[PDB]
Every structure is written in structure tokens, then in C-alpha cells.
A paper describes a structure:
Acetyl-CoA synthetase ([name]) generates acetyl-coenzyme A (Ac-CoA) but its excessive activity can deplete ATP and lead to a growth arrest. To prevent this, [name] is regulated through Ac-CoA-dependent feedback inhibition executed by Ac-CoA-dependent acetyltransferases such as AcuA in [name]. AcuA acetylates the catalytic lysine of [name] turning the synthetase inactive. [name] enzymes consists of two consecutively operating modules, a C-terminal domain (CTD) catalyzing the first and a N-terminal domain (NTD) for the second reaction step.
Author numbering:
A (entry chain B), B (entry chain A): 5 to 453
Write the structure that this text describes.
């Protein structure tokens, strides 16, 4: 059991906050509580650009060809420009699905934020998807607009999708066809002021496609209200301060990079770092050393591959700027935890959630001891349990299905065009079952199986 | 008489503060007041880089070839690197004179900050100086180190200066001679951590050379304590908020671009903008529109050339971001005031000071009415008057010599290696005379002649 380290954490004590927390208190930190105008994108970007965080660096893009950095004001301007481009050329209205199919780049974030600002539902696609996956995801969602690069423009079958009107191409000298629009040319002539579509807490703003047990991808829809939890988990689990440099290594194509690489940091007003190109221990360690990254959010595969690079490889670089390390996507091996404590002299914080959950649910905390191999405890305001097939709670140390009490803000609203699968996730008694096996200890800690 | 505009200014009421202000209150905003370790460079840069302003953009640089942005952390790191370079290669110790002879560039600011951090006295030279002026200024100061560029390396007579040991060259493929060190290679191998030389309030940190009435340049020495006034005038006259973009167009070679282009903004933790290349209305208006500059500090000549450009030239660009405009270096023709109020719809704030005064003394304020053509009123904590040749105050509307009561923090400590000229600036009764004629009105406003 790795002991906790004393410090000035956002969550001072877990127990009292868990016993007393109410989501109405979390709703106080947002602008719409005082004004009534609600939008996740506005809360993530434009709220800070109109505050003392206006000139704070929001985004750090490092790539071999280009090295750029943007402030909150510049991010807001680029997002407004992208939203105007989409509204004018793609004819995107509230509720439309805008799919973004490009490698990780500042334009990706600008376009995603602009799409969400104007009321569209943004769906990111992995750059490595072939023709089949792109076809299925564009057909199921009936996506109106796709934004891509010349390299991946050949992987989209425009002729096989009657519901796809416009294709935006960023970069390169792409010839604008009947349904192809060169994004940069349109953007250069657009304004930086956007009339933001004010939304309702039950309207969707993200659409993420997951590989289902039946073999067909399903669209998970998240609503704006999820930002509430996205903010709170950004403060408790990430422990984001004002002086933190935050780096999330997950791709924006997946849910992890979209939630905790875009929204969780920027809702807290943090500084986010994205790095282009493929993985290499040289590039990652050099990025950490040069940018002085304080908060790191990565995946167990990347950490294990880091382990494969050797201890001296890390010892060649200065990693003293790091202060908080977190992992997600796979239940972490405690040997990786020992290696991290041996290299960075830090505890790697394992967190658990799924695409349907919207945000992390069961996590390790800076103020809590970390038991190696354990997922941790549910966040305050969220109730979790180990239940049988009849919805009855099981005593500790008994194997069972990991269930969460229905009703947390970051819950998925539905499964796109498949209500039966949506209702298939819930058990009698208000228990959302995740299909995963876990067991609770006598101390309240959860262990995955 | 241009009326004042209501707003949330730092100086809410001029009269009450002027009647009650004491410099001991101003001393409370600095770290040294509690810690006891005093340095102007630390207060300007490293204090903010260790606060909630760590990731705030400190410097924008823009020219025809480069476009870079630096945060307070990055500025601190570059300054520490430059200080280490100077300490190791130039053998610069406390009290030495380090002269900087280069065009405006991030390297200039890094080198000047690093020199001041290690206790040296920084002296900037105008890029347009020929061999004669550089020779006189390097001989009078007995400067140990000169830092320059390959273009201006030919304008320095190394052989004629026995007191010049090292010459640093930044950029270009300069062959390192017996006394020539190429700055970039030395910097690349140096650390970003600097053991800062903690100083005393009466030690000099700036040396500025002015054209004297006798024809020979004289070295005006300013002490660290001046930062106090440099901070206060940065808050009252500049009206710097947290969300202000500050642009000073004066060259760092002169006193104006050093006090109010380096120290006054960064002591307040503001964002400074520097633009390379020659003046052109296209470049200046585009810089204002693109960066959204809020606070502007320029010179009447630069405003007059923008007059010559025409109103239709400015009407093309977006200048709504500007909220405060100030002028210095020459009495301001009030026709320029009407033109500014016509174009930017703003009041141009004229300020008066000299190289010997260290910071502005008599200014217009955001909370005060601006009488066109008047220099304004003395800052709180500074007493000014119109005196005759015998040191007696004159009644309003009578011509006389403009004198300031001796003892303000930003006073020059001495004239370098010439005490007689230093004592020649003061009259009996504690009145420092500036050699300029001005008259007071019945309302306390000063008018230059």
C-alpha cells in the first residue's frame, strides 16, 4: 500500500466531501448558474478568454514541422472562426452530426470546439480507420459534414453515403469539388466573432462510437450536462491548479482524448499539451523536460512501452517538473506503479470509466492512499456497488457485476438510434451495469477482475 | 478640455491618494519587503514565474521572419541562461558594466535581464550608432563586455578600448576569436537555473547615455530602488490590469524602451509586445488588430507618421481592442489628441520625464480630465513646482524652471565618473532642476514651454 503524500490538494479529505457533496454545489462554478445560458464549449474556452486567464497559454502544440502555442483568447478566436466556417459552408444546424477525421493537430481542436459551439454533435474518428469503419460510422450517425485531410480523403466513400453533404479538407492543395471545400481558404475570410448557440442540459454534444459485443459499432451520445462532472473530476482526480502544465497523450479520436484532453483541462482553465508524430521515448521525455509538464495523463500501454525503453533513457532527461501522473484505458499493473515511483518518484493514479460513463467514476486521489492494482473509490456524488444478477448489493470480497447507481450527470443520454441497447445497460433497482466484474474490499476499495 | 471616462481604474481618486500616499505602502507589493532579498530583475520576471502568472504570455515578438511567444516561465529560463552565459564566459561580476548593442529581439531582453540578475549594470546602445558614439560610450563606462550581432560587430573598435575584454556575437556564423564568443553555442550548453545575485537598493542596475549640453555623452546611473516607482507608475499611469496586452514602441536602446518596455510592464505582470522591422502603418495597425493590444505606449513622432498615413488607412483595421494610449518623449501637439479621439475614440495620455528621472513624474491619468497640451499633474509621492533661480516657488501662470523635490525613489544615483555634473542638477532647497521651462495653472496642471 503506497502511502499518500501531504500537500495542498483540491480535495483535502475524501470522506467528509463524499458524505456531504451535492451536485448543486458543483453547479455553482459555472456561468449558466448566474445567467441561464448553457454550453459546454463556452464553459471550456470562452469563459476563460473573458477572465484573468485571457493571456494564459491554453494549448501547446509541438511537432517536428511546426511548433506553436495558443492562448485562451487565440483558442477562442480560432474556435469562433471554425464555427463560422461550419455554419456558412457546411450548413450545420443545431443537432447535426459533424464528424472530424484528421490526425491530431490544432485545427482538429478548433474545428471540434467550433462544431460544439454552434450546437452540432461532434464525433471524432481515429486517423487509422480504414474505409469500412469510416463508412459504418458515417452511415449510422447520418453525419451531415466530415472534416478531413488530403491524406485520408481517399478513405471516405462519399458515393455510398446519401446523408453526407459536405467534405471539408484542411491543408494541401485539394481541388474544391461539388462536395469538397478547402477549409483554409474559407477560414481565412471568416470572422473571429461567433453567435454561440445556447443549449439545454439534455442536448447532446458528443458522439463516440465503440466496438460492440455484437460486432457493430454503436453511437454513445453525451449531453452538455456532463461538463459538470467533467469539471469536478477535473478538479479532484486531475488536481489541476492554476500553475499546472497538463499533458494528455490519448488521441482525440477516442473518448479519453476528447473528454480529458479537451474538456476536463479547459473547464478548469488549465494548460493543455498535445504532441504530434508517433511515440518515441526521446520525444516524450524531451517534451516533458522542455515544457515542464506538471500533470500527466497517459495509458498503461504507453507506460509499459516506456518501461521497455530502459531506466537510463529516462535518467538522461530532467523529469522533476512532474507532480501528478494518471493512467486510464486498462487496469494498471502494479509493476508499472513501482517503476513510476522509481523513476519520477511519484504515484501513478489509476482511474476507471468507460465511453458510456462520460467521465471517471472510480479513481485514486492525491489525498488518498493508493493500493497497487486497485481502481480506487467512487467520486463524491456518485454511488457504486457490486451487485448480482438480481440487483442486490453483495458483501465485500464477493465477486459480482460492477454497477453504478443511475443518475450521475455524465451518464450517456442514449445509444444513437438503438433504444433497446440503451435500456440493455440497466438493471432493476436503478443500477447501471457495465458488464465488468469487480469486487469491493472492507475499506471500500474496488478491485477489477 | 477632454472629460474623463468613468471606469474601474487602479487610481480611483487622484486627490485623496496624492494627499495620503506614502512610498512605504508601495514597498509592500514586493517580495523583498518580507523576504529581504532585493533585485529589480527578480521582481520583474522570476516573481511572476513562481506565481499564478507562470503560464501567462509575457512576451510577443513579431517581425518579417519570426513569430514567437514566450511565457513568464520561458522568459525566466532564457534570462537565467543568459546570466549563466555572461557569468561563465564574460567573467562578469557585481558592479560590472555590460553593454548590449543589437536590434530589438528576444535575445536582447534575455541578455539584459540576465545581466541585471547577476548584479551587472546593463547599458543598451542604439543599433544606429556609428563607430564614434559606440567608442565614446564604451570608453566612458569602461564596459567589460559588449554583446552584439555580426552586422554591427564591425562598428565597435575593440583595439581602441583597453577596458573591453569580451565581445559576444548572437546569430550568424561568426568565428570565435581571442575576444569573440558566439552567444548561441555558449547558451545551448548552459543551464536554466541561475543563482541570482541579491543586491542593495542603492546599487546601480541601468546605465543610460544621453547627449549632453557640452557635447559629450554622460552616463546616467539608476539604482534598484527605482523599481518601486517603476511599479507604481506602471499601475497608475499605464493602468495595467491582468487582462491587458501592452505594447511599447520605443527602442530598448533608449531609456524609454528599457524602463517602460521591460520593467514597468513586467513588474506589474503584464503582457508585452515587441515588433521588429521598420515602422509602417500596415505593420503597426495589423499588429494591434492581430494581438488585440489594450495598452499602447508610443511617441508623438510615431503618431504623426500615422497621421500622415491617413484615416482611411486605420479604418480598414480593427482597433476596438485598444483601451489606453500614452505618449512620451516630446510635448504632444494637441491636434494629435483630436486625431486619436477621432480614430481610436480614445484620449492620448501625455507623460513627462527624462533619463535622469528614472520614471514618469508628471502625467495624465485615466481618472483625471485631460487638458490638451498639458503634461498633467505629479504622481502621488512626488512633489513638483515652478521655481526661480533662487529656489523660491512661483505663483501659478508665471514662467519659471520646472523643479522636482529631491528624494523620489527613481532618482538617478549619480552621473557616471563625473560628480560635478551630478551636483549641477540640484538647487538650494532640495530642488532638482531639469533645465526645462514650465508653468503651473490654478488647477495644478503643468504646461510645458
Amino acid at each position: 500500500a503506497l502511502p499518500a503524500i501531504e500537500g495542498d490538494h483540491n480535495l483535502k479529505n475524501y470522506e467528509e466531501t463524499y458524505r456531504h457533496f451535492d451536485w448543486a454545489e458543483a453547479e455553482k462554478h459555472f456561468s449558466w448558474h448566474e445567467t441561464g445560458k448553457l454550453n459546454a464549449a463556452y464553459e471550456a474556452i470562452d469563459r476563460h478568454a473573458e477572465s484573468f486567464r485571457k493571456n494564459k497559454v491554453a494549448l501547446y502544440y509541438k511537432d517536428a514541422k511546426r511548433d506553436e502555442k495558443y492562448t485562451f483568447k487565440e483558442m477562442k478566436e480560432e474556435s469562433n472562426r471554425a464555427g463560422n466556417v461550419l455554419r456558412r459552408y457546411g450548413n450545420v444546424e443545431k443537432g447535426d452530426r459533424v464528424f472530424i477525421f484528421m490526425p491530431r493537430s490544432p485545427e482538429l481542436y478548433f474545428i471540434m470546439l467550433g462544431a460544439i459551439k454552434i450546437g452540432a454533435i461532434a464525433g471524432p474518428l481515429f486517423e487509422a480507420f480504414m474505409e469500412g469503419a469510416v463508412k459504418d460510422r458515417l452511415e449510422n450517425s447520418e453525419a451531415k459534414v466530415v472534416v478531413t485531410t488530403p491524406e485520408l480523403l481517399e478513405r471516405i466513400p462519399v458515393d455510398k453515403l446519401p446523408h453526407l453533404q459536405h467534405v471539408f479538407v484542411v491543408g494541401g492543395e485539394a481541388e474544391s469539388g461539388t462536395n469538397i471545400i478547402n477549409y483554409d481558404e474559407a477560414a481565412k475570410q471568416e470572422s473571429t466573432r461567433l453567435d454561440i448557440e445556447w443549449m439545454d442540459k439534455k442536448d447532446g454534444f458528443l458522439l463516440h462510437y465503440t466496438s460492440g459485443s455484437t460486432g457493430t459499432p454503436k453511437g454513445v451520445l453525451h449531453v452538455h450536462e456532463a461538463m459538470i462532472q467533467q469539471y469536478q473530476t477535473g478538479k479532484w482526480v486531475l488536481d489541476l491548479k492554476e500553475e499546472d502544465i497538463y499533458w494528455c497523450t490519448a488521441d482525440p479520436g477516442w473518448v479519453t482524448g476528447t473528454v480529458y484532453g479537451i474538456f476536463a483541462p479547459w473547464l478548469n482553465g488549465a494548460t493543455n499539451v498535445i504532441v504530434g508524430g508517433r511515440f518515441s521515448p526521446e520525444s516524450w521525455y524531451g517534451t516533458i523536460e522542455q515544457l515542464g509538464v506538471n500533470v500527466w495523463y497517459s495509458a498503461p500501454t504507453a507506460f509499459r512501452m516506456l518501461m521497455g525503453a530502459g531506466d537510463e533513457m529516462a535518467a538522461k532527461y530532467d523529469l522533476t517538473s512532474l507532480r501528478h501522473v494518471l493512467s486510464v484505458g486498462e487496469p494498471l499493473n502494479p509493476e508499472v506503479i513501482r517503476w513510476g515511483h522509481k523513476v519520477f518518484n511519484k504515484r501513478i493514479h489509476d482511474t476507471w470509466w468507460m465511453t458510456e460513463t462520460g467521465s471517471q467514476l472510480i479513481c485514486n486521489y492525491p489525498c488518498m492512499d493508493i493500493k497497487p492494482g486497485s481502481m480506487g473509490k467512487p467520486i463524491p456524488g456518485v454511488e457504486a456497488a457490486i451487485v448480482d444478477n438480481q440487483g442486490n448489493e453483495l458483501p465485500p470480497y464477493r465477486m459480482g457485476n460492477l454497477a453504478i447507481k443511475k443518475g450521475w450527470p455524465s451518464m450517456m443520454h442514449t445509444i444513437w438510434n438503438n433504444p433497446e441497447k440503451y435500456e440493455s445497460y440497466f438493471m432493476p433497482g436503478g443500477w447501471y451495469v457495465s458488464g465488468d466484474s469487480a469486487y469491493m474490499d472492507e475499506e471500500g476499495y474496488f478491485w477489477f477482475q
